[PDB]
Design a protein around this ligand. Structure first.
Ligand SMILES: [Cl-]
Ligand SMILES: [Cl-]
Ligand SMILES: [Cl-]
Ligand SMILES: [Cl-]
Lengths: 296, 296, 296, 296
């Protein structure tokens, strides 16, 4: 041999006065370095070195050439330093968004495992849902998002990799009059806390009512906050839909009961979403692997 | 001169990103929508939209115009709703954001009380924090935010009415190495999950370490989601700060312990924030009253 | 109607105490304004005005409504002011690039005519050639470019409108030994000043040599500057190619002679190039019209 | 460790914007090129290229790396060329930029003289001005620039050797209203074509108006092209400043007149500018000598 190795060796030769000593010091093959310098001299059509009783010195040509060699060796080191600095900041940070089912079950175990493997990466995690996360995924402010989406609706700009097949549960307060219901039609007159979903607030229950041949569900309120949702429901007669993970993991469990209908609800697929054109850091790859491991 | 229907059409266009998609929603012919938009553009003598691969996007002029469009449309709607309320037709919409201490304690009781008194008003609740909420207060899309803030910081066109003085605790997993610590200095070498705050992630612990003469706290990760935070802490050795309300009301209580520090921590004030010059609707004032009632 | 006219009228009514006087002052039809206010009151389901012996006053409902009306009227004026400010800066400036044949013959007459019609537009003109101008056209720093290009080679991002069919002439010093040549083959051993062209320096003469079955032309030097080219040639034995306009309009005319070969050279088409997705100001449109007028 | 051939390949890729297009130029298999690039990326542990619709583009890492790549490649080439020249093989390349006074007077004579002495060196001349030329001096793609500059301003890593002290005149059309003016104050209300200068367009006339106690000169237009400038002035009532050399040597002399002012105008110094730590090739030094000879 590599020209940069030969140039670094030439610099060392000027300093120590010996091709052989410079080879030894740099851990290069002496005959290899000798052949490499010969090849360079042939290409340049002039000798760089002249033999002395001492060892070797630079020729007039070698002194001229060395000014360039030093610039080139320094520039290569500067390039490597700059790339190291830029890469270090890139590899050193992850920012992503996560939906409640991921945030509550997969993430905590995944973050702990991840941090053992990648002790020097700063992770920035926020709540996020599709398509809200889309402009942030696209402008590059969010590296990836872990969110429910409908395969056919996802922006062409985005890659989508399935992560978890989630459950939706209908939930009300522990003593709700409809707690024993078997069919969705039995709930058709209840009032709903419309919760967040890819197609808009309440889209899941609205679409379920529609497919089961029912009128629009009655809007009680819109609660886009999953943090607030279990408590709002616990202290009202509203029904809602939520991921089963949230039903299992909230501060109001003693005050809530799911209503296990014999009518099936959808199982939203949670995806890893990101721009397809955009390179992924090793750490981001590693975190997604850990999240995948804990999402089964 | 601007036409109100066209403003609403432009907002819809922005929401969905296509002329064809918007036209469907507004029950209008594709060209009919274009006629109206072109009318607004022809007169402003400025293009508001640009054809993209994915549909239409706002030009620079369009982006600037939107904040005005939204305030005009939302104020026109609030004007109508208020008049109805003044005649005892208690219908309308209220959209507001809340912080974790409010959402978990005051809000479930307040919304239940409000709904009993004003059954026909449609309420939309979301998460939110100052200053992120400021642009939505200014354009009228958010009627108020219940959020921590520092009195002196708040922008001059906003009004801030005190709602609740919160309590901050430091929390770790139940068997944390420092579970029995009583001084902030003993935590100097611990790693932190930086939680959200008006002054930015980790601001409370950074400012507490500062005032107690300590170096910067060691960043473990940034967790902007209060929904995710307790579980993240429960399954790691990260410490965090959280509102006492969250410490008492989360899904991981049995796995968490507050550190029994005898160094005092701050007590952030939660405010009702609004754009001052906008007249509060009677319905919104009623909801704010119920929230205040339950926040004491 | 228009709601904003009705709102402005309502503001005036509060001030002057008369619907009829407010209509007269604003140059609105009295019966039209009366009907418009009635329609608004019907929509709001409350009266805004009550008759007095004096004229009219606002009702309690009208006083509440007026707070919103004033915000809406102010906001519309602010929107119009902001758009005016943004549009004014957009319409007030043009920046473009031009090739030598345009710069020397069409532009000076076109700029003078343009400036009479658009006295308040600042024009910024620079030299430019395709494809060098492409990244600047695409990022929006250059509004348009007037340059030679090959139709099939132009970026899909760009619109191209033909402006002028130019002539290429071979030029040497007045006494060049080959001044009387009739065939390109007679020049095959001459040395060339490679001049700028869309396909790279010397592309025209290299491609002409190739099509006429000749070897590569001999490179004397590369002169990318058309400003420098006529003088460099006047003081050497180099031949070059240049637009006929440059041959006719340079400081070294007395020292140069074109060599009128019977072998034809190409006639590069000069285009107006720009991003197709990007809206064009009236002034830019007007300038291009003036340039077109003077490019025939 | 970096490989020189791969750096050259990356520069070629950047020039043409496609892997396929670059591979053709370098006489290599598509995949072979990718192998080499992937080798450089795999080792840097950073992506240098991204697939776009139009081919490939440099990543942030790639853009940062390019300045280093270019200096390394161009220094390696200069090293070889210098060695050849030191053996009396006067071949190589010199690339340089020149300002209008130099290009029109000194340059035609200097290039002719240089070509007689060093017939086998390939010279590439372009227009250029400080500070626009600085990045190309730093990355080694431009060997020197002959340009006006202010001594004190010049960046510390650049060397500036004085070449010529120029003369500025104010010029208008022959029958200009102010053709017979003798004081700068008499021109206060005239409109100006702002011509290019190291401190920005119009800097000379702005700074002259300033020093003479006058208000800002009235901007008529900005004309960055000295090629276009004389014709633009000849066919309008715009005044401009230009080097006296340009006033004497342009295509519109019969239609132009210098204003016979008895207020003194500045005399900008033209310098030879280079990156100081780069060793000047013997051939470049020879060309600089001839330019100095003719600039006196
Ligand atoms: Cl959905
Ligand atoms: Cl804070
Ligand atoms: Cl070409
Ligand atoms: Cl200057």
């Amino acid at each position: 041999m590599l020209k940069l190795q030969t140039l670094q060796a030439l610099i060392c030769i000027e300093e120590v006065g010996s091709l052989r000593a410079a080879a030894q010091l740099l851990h290069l093959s002496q005959p290899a370095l000798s052949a490499a310098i010969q090849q360079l001299e042939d290409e340049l059509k002039a000798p760089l070195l002249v033999r002395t009783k001492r060892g070797v010195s630079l020729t007039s040509f070698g002194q001229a050439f060395m000014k360039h060699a030093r610039l080139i060796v320094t520039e290569s080191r500067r390039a490597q330093e700059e790339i190291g600095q830029l890469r270090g900041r890139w590899e050193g940070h992850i920012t992503f968004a996560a939906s409640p089912a991921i945030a509550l079950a997969a993430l905590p175990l995944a973050l702990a495992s991840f941090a053992r493997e990648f002790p020097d990466v700063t992770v920035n995690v926020r709540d996020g849902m599709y398509p809200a996360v889309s402009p942030q995924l696209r402008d590059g402010t969010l590296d990836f998002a872990l969110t429910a989406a409908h395969k056919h609706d996802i922006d062409t700009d985005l890659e989508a990799q399935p992560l978890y097949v989630s459950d939706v549960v209908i939930v009300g307060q522990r003593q709700h009059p409809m707690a024993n219901a078997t069919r969705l039609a039995e709930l058709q007159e209840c009032r709903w806390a419309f919760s967040s979903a890819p197609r808009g607030p309440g889209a899941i229950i609205r679409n379920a009512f529609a497919r089961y041949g029912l009128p629009e569900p009655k809007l009680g309120l819109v609660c886009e906050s999953f943090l607030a949702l279990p408590g709002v429901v616990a202290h009202s007669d509203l029904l809602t839909t939520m991921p089963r993970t949230l039903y299992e993991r909230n501060a109001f469990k003693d005050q809530l009961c799911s209503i296990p209908l014999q009518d099936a609800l959808p199982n939203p697929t949670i995806y890893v979403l990101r721009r397809h054109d955009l390179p992924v850091t090793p750490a981001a790859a590693g975190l997604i692997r850990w999240i995948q491991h804990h999402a089964l």
